[PDB]
Write a protein that binds this ligand. Structure first.
Ligand SMILES: [Zn+2]
Ligand SMILES: [Zn+2]
Lengths: 5, 45, 337, 64, 108
C-alpha cells in the first residue's frame, strides 16, 4: 500500500 | 480372548475351534474381528 | 536517440523486451565490472507492513536473479520442524492410519528449528538433539448429563472432534529445561484432526524431525514468499471531463486519483503501487493511447507470510544467511584444492 | 471427507477455518463476505473452503 | 571437505585452464543463476553459463571460459566472494530497516 510513513 | 463384534447386535462374541459361528443375543452369521492395541509405524509423507 | 533506463514498457499484444541493460559491456560507457560501492549506494530496503505472519518490504535496487534466489530460499531451503513418523497403538476412527499420519505431518509445530539438528541417516531412535515427541490420546463417550437433544456437542460428546489442543508434548530428554512449559506446542490449537463417535479412540505418538521445504512441503515455513516488480503508470496527456472517471475505473481503484483542480476534473496517478495488472485500459480504444503502464526496472515488492513457526523478518534473515552459507560452503570447498 | 489442513497450491493452513466458516454462514453472511472475514484472499484458498464437501458427517452415522 | 556434494571440475579438451566446467552438487537454479549473474560482471570472462543436467539429478554444471591469461578458477572464486558480500550487505541493510520500522511503530 505505501512503505512506512 | 479373541473378540468379534456382531453385524448389527454389536455384542462381543469369542469363538474358537470346533464351534459354530453364530452370534449370541441374536443369530446373525457375520462377525467382524476387533482391533487390539498393537504398535504400527506410519510415515507422514 | 532515446534511452529508457528504468522501466519494462508494455502494451497489450505482448511486452517489449526482457533485458535490464545494467551488465558489463551493455552500453558505450555504461559498462559494468561490479562496482561494489555503487551497489551499496543504490541499494535500499523499505519495510511497509509488518504484522505478525506478514512483511512487505521493498528491496529497491537488486537484480532479478538475486531476488529470485531469496524467494526460492524461503519456499524451499529455510529449515522447519514437522512430524515424520507416527506410531499408532490403536485407532478405531473413521480416518485411516495412513491418512491420519499424512494429516499429522501437515500440522505446523512452534519449535524453532535453529536449536535442533538433522537426524543422521538411519537414526530411527532420535535423541534430545534432533527430535520432539507429541502424544494424541482421545476417546469419545456419551455424556451422562444430557437430555433428549441432538446437538452433537451436548450429547455423544466428550471428545467428538479431535483438535491440535489434544496433542501433548512428551519432553524427550533434558528438553523440559531449555524449553519452558508453553514454548514447544503446535502453532494452531483449532485444527480439526478427526471426528469420533462414542466408543471410538485415537492413540498415537508423533515424532518431529528437522528438514527443508525442498524434500517435502510440510517442512516449508512460508505460505507464499513471492515478489512483484513495482508498476509504473504515466499519463501522457491530461485526462479530464468525465473521461477521468472512466480512466479511474480501468485500474485498481486507488491508483488514479481524480482531483478537481478547476471546474473540470483532472485524473492524477496517486499511488502506482496498488495497481494489479489487469490491462483493462487496453479495452477502452480511446484511452489506451493516453496511459503508458510498465514496470520499474529493479524495484521489487516482497511479501512473506509465515505459517507461525518463525516471524517473517527472522525468516528473511535466515534466507539471506542460507544463501551466504551456500556461497561459503562452495568457497571453502574450492579452497580445499 | 474432512477439511484439508493446508491449501494445496500455497500451503496456507485452512484446517482451522471450517467451524468459523460454518458459524459465519449461520449468522447471515454470504460465502464471499464469509471467506473474506476469515482471511482467505487469493482464490486458491477460497476454493479450498467454498467447494468442500464434509462427508465425515455422513460416514459418522453407520454403526460403530 | 565433502568430496562430491561439492565441486568436481572438468578442464576442457586439452585441459584448457581458461575453459572449465564445474559440477556443483545439491544445487538448483538458485545458486546457479545468482552465481552466473555474479560471474558475468567480470570483464575477464568471455563465456559463463550454467545448466541443470537432468531433473532427476541434483547438480548443476557451470561453464566458465575466461580470456587468455587467468585460469578461469579465479572468476569463479571471485563471483562467489562478490555474491557473499552482496548477501551480507543486504542482510545488514534489511535488519537495520526492520529495526528502524519497529521503533517508528512502537513509539507512535
Ligand atoms: Zn449379536
Ligand atoms: Zn492458497
Amino acid at each position: 500500500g505505501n512503505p512506512p510513513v | 480372548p479373541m473378540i468379534y463384534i456382531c453385524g448389527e447386535c454389536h455384542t462381543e462374541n469369542e469363538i474358537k475351534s470346533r464351534d459354530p459361528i453364530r452370534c449370541r443375543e441374536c443369530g446373525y452369521r457375520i462377525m467382524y474381528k476387533k482391533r487390539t492395541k498393537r504398535l504400527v509405524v506410519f510415515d507422514a509423507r | 536517440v532515446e534511452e529508457m533506463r528504468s522501466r519494462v514498457v508494455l502494451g497489450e499484444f505482448g511486452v517489449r523486451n526482457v533485458h535490464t541493460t545494467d551488465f558489463p559491456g551493455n552500453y558505450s560507457g555504461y559498462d559494468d565490472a561490479w562496482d561494489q560501492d555503487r551497489f551499496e549506494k543504490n541499494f535500499r530496503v523499505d519495510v511497509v507492513h509488518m504484522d505478525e505472519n506478514s512483511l512487505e518490504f521493498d528491496m529497491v535496487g537488486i537484480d532479478a536473479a538475486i531476488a529470485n534466489a531469496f524467494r526460492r530460499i524461503l519456499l524451499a531451503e529455510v529449515p522447519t520442524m514437522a512430524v515424520e513418523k507416527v506410531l499408532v497403538y490403536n485407532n478405531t476412527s473413521i480416518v485411516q492410519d495412513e491418512i491420519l499420519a499424512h494429516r499429522l505431518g501437515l500440522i505446523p509445530i512452534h519449535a524453532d528449528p535453529r536449536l535442533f539438528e538433522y537426524r543422521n541417516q538411519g537414526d530411527e531412535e532420535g535423541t534430545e538433539i534432533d527430535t520432539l515427541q507429541f502424544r494424541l490420546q482421545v476417546r469419545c463417550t456419551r455424556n451422562p448429563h444430557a437430555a433428549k437433544d441432538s446437538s452433537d456437542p451436548n450429547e455423544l460428546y466428550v471428545n467428538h472432534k479431535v483438535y491440535t489442543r489434544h496433542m501433548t508434548w512428551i519432553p524427550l530428554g533434558n528438553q523440559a529445561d531449555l524449553f519452558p512449559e508453553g514454548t514447544i506446542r503446535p502453532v494452531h490449537d483449532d485444527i480439526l484432526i478427526a471426528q469420533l463417535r462414542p466408543g471410538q479412540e485415537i492413540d498415537l505418538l508423533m515424532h518431529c524431525v528437522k528438514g527443508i521445504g525442498k524434500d517435502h512441503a510440510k517442512f516449508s515455513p512460508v505460505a507464499t514468499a513471492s515478489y512483484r516488480l513495482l508498476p509504473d503508470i504515466t499519463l501522457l496527456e491530461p485526462v479530464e471531463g468525465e473521461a477521468a472517471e472512466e480512466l479511474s475505473r480501468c485500474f485498481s481503484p486507488g491508483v488514479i486519483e481524480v482531483q478537481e483542480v478547476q471546474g473540470k476534473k483532472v485524473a492524477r496517478v496517486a499511488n502506482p503501487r496498488l495497481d494489479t495488472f489487469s490491462r483493462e485500459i487496453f479495452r477502452n480504444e480511446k484511452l489506451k493511447k493516453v496511459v503508458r503502464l510498465a514496470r520499474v526496472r529493479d524495484h521489487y515488492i516482497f511479501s512473506v507470510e509465515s505459517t507461525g513457526v518463525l516471524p517473517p523478518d527472522v525468516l528473511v534473515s535466515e534466507a539471506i544467511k542460507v544463501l551466504m552459507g551456500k556461497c561459503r560452503r562452495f568457497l571453502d570447498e574450492l579452497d580445499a584444492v | 471427507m474432512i477439511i484439508p489442513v493446508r491449501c494445496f497450491t500455497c500451503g496456507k493452513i485452512v484446517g482451522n477455518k471450517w467451524e468459523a466458516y460454518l458459524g459465519l454462514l449461520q449468522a447471515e453472511y454470504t460465502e464471499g463476505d464469509a471467506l473474506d472475514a476469515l482471511g482467505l484472499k487469493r482464490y486458491c484458498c477460497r476454493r479450498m473452503l467454498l467447494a468442500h464437501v464434509d462427508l465425515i458427517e455422513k460416514l459418522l452415522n453407520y454403526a460403530p | 571437505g565433502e568430496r562430491k556434494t561439492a565441486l568436481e571440475m572438468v578442464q576442457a579438451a586439452g585441459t584448457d585452464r581458461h575453459c572449465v566446467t564445474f559440477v556443483l552438487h545439491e544445487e538448483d537454479h538458485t545458486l546457479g543463476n545468482s552465481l552466473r549473474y555474479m560471474i558475468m560482471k567480470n570483464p575477464e570472462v568471455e563465456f559463463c553459463g550454467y545448466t541443470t543436467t537432468h531433473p532427476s539429478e541434483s547438480k548443476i554444471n557451470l561453464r566458465i571460459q575466461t580470456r587468455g591469461t587467468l585460469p578461469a578458477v579465479e572468476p569463479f572464486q571471485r563471483g562467489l566472494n562478490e555474491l557473499m558480500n552482496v548477501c551480507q550487505h543486504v542482510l545488514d541493510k534489511f535488519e537495520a530497516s526492520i529495526k528502524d520500522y519497529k521503533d517508528q511503530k512502537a513509539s507512535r
